[PDB]
Amino acid sequence: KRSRKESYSIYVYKVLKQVHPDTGISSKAMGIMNSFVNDIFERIAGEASRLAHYNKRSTITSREIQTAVRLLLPGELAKHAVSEGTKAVTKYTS
Template sequence: MQQPQQVDEDETQPADEPEEMPTPPQIEAVQKKAQAQKRKPGPSHKVEGEKRKKKRAKVGASEGYRTYVYKVMKQVHPDMGISSKAMTILNNLMGDMFERIANEAAILAKYVGRATLASVDIQDAVKLVLPGELGKHAIAEGTKAVANYVSSVGKSKSKA
């Protein structure tokens, strides 16, 4: 009589070689070793005396113009304060005006066929968004502010 041959259900292993399943302690040791390698960077990554740089916390978009409105208010009226509701209203007003002027300037630049905004586009947008004398004064103050900035940047470069 012939003995029936052993049939291996797993076709990946030959029938004459026994399958080796790792025991649970071996699995745990392999996992611990992998975790230890992930946690500890090699000595080549570390330089003596070097500390990791702290990441700056991102300032939320909710700040907006609040800081600048407050600084200007203190320049004009040092003894005055402002409520948080009034500050929110001014912040929203500034954001709205910026958006209106930017959109109008973009439309003007597209109309002319340019991809880059020029100062003339901003000035024309201000004239369209702000009526009459208000627009003229805004352009004059904006031009003055840009001139002050350019002169202050030129001075700081010459010192360096």
């Protein structure tokens, strides 16, 4: 058989079945969504890495990710994303 290749298809589909329970998605649209998720992951991770390097640290904590989100996302996408991430981290820890 072919070698295994990972993707974000099932998670994007699970997210889609929450906002719109009665809507499907094409294969090309799923490819575009996977590319978008990969691109944003790379952007945020790289900004966090540089941010941690500037302060002579060795760890990428949630603070570096928060500041990277603040730097990268536009006006209020940043506010809402920071709120969601803080909510998720607080819910995970306790």
